[PDB]
């Protein structure tokens, strides 16, 4: 199992400087076939992630030329150059080459204090322990059975940082992780493109935000280019 280690916690900036975020993994990151695939993603405080930097080198559309991925092998290191209010937030690193992929621990960046593809997710759910859940994501401006999509799902707990939890794929290919220990189940409406994570035996571990990501193309190296806006789980 693969462990990635962001190495700065904090590293606080103040606008214009240089900035640099760094992540090792406890394997090889490579696949089989020529490839690293390695993420970063951005949450700005109150909203989901989003897709910075695929395949170790390479900027999302939308994403300024400030941003440049500069890895290699074990190690890896986002660099911004300059700065910008809108730079603000926690950083994760993300391989995406092994069974259970693994998030980083998170970076925050913070100021020096001093002188039309859509995925549309189910409203928050309040139980008691015991129970069970189906949450919902709902893909629009494109086609769940396009070659190359799938849907991954990642769960954030408050101070636990990112997981990942399921997947599933445009032949309706469904994998989990055993950390779970088969209480999860996916589903698929396909007619109503809608996805379904089902969470079976529910303790207060389990109370988390749960965003649903798309996979992206071939072409963005299966990086999660769009993400739902979260759904709230709370168990009493």
């Known amino acids: 199992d693969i462990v990635m280690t962001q190495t700065p916690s904090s590293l606080p900036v103040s606008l214009g400087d240089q900035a640099s975020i760094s992540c090792r993994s406890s394997?090889?990151?490579?696949?089989?076939?020529?490839?690293?695939?390695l993420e970063w993603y951005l949450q700005k405080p109150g909203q989901s992630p989003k897709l910075l930097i695929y395949?170790?080198?390479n900027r999302f559309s939308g994403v300024p030329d400030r941003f440049s991925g500069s890895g290699s092998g074990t190690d890896f290191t986002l660099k911004i150059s300059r700065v910008e209010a809108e730079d603000l937030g926690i950083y994760y690193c993300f391989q995406g080459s092994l069974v259970p992929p693994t998030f980083g621990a998170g970076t925050k960046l913070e100021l020096k204090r001093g002188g039309q593809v859509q995925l549309q997710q189910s409203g928050p759910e309040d139980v008691k322990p015991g129970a069970s859940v189906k949450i919902s994501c709902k893909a629009s401006?494109?086609?769940?059975?396009?070659?190359?999509?799938?849907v991954n799902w990642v769960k954030q707990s408050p101070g636990k940082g990112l997981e990942w939890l399921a997947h599933?794929?445009?032949?309706?290919?469904?994998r989990y992780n055993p950390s779970l220990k088969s209480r999860a189940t996916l589903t698929v409406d396909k007619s109503s493109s809608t996805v379904y994570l089902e969470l079976r035996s529910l303790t207060s571990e389990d109370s988390s935000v749960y965003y649903c990501?798309?996979?992206?193309?071939?072409?963005?190296?299966?990086?999660?280019?769009?993400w739902g806006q979260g759904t709230t789980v709370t168990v009493s």
């Open positions: 599933i794929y445009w032949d309706d290919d469904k």
């Open positions: 394997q090889s990151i490579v696949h089989s076939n020529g490839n690293t695939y």
């Open positions: 990501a798309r996979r992206g193309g071939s072409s963005h190296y299966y990086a999660m280019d769009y």
């Open positions: 395949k170790v080198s």
């Open positions: 401006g494109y086609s769940l059975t396009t070659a190359g999509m799938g």
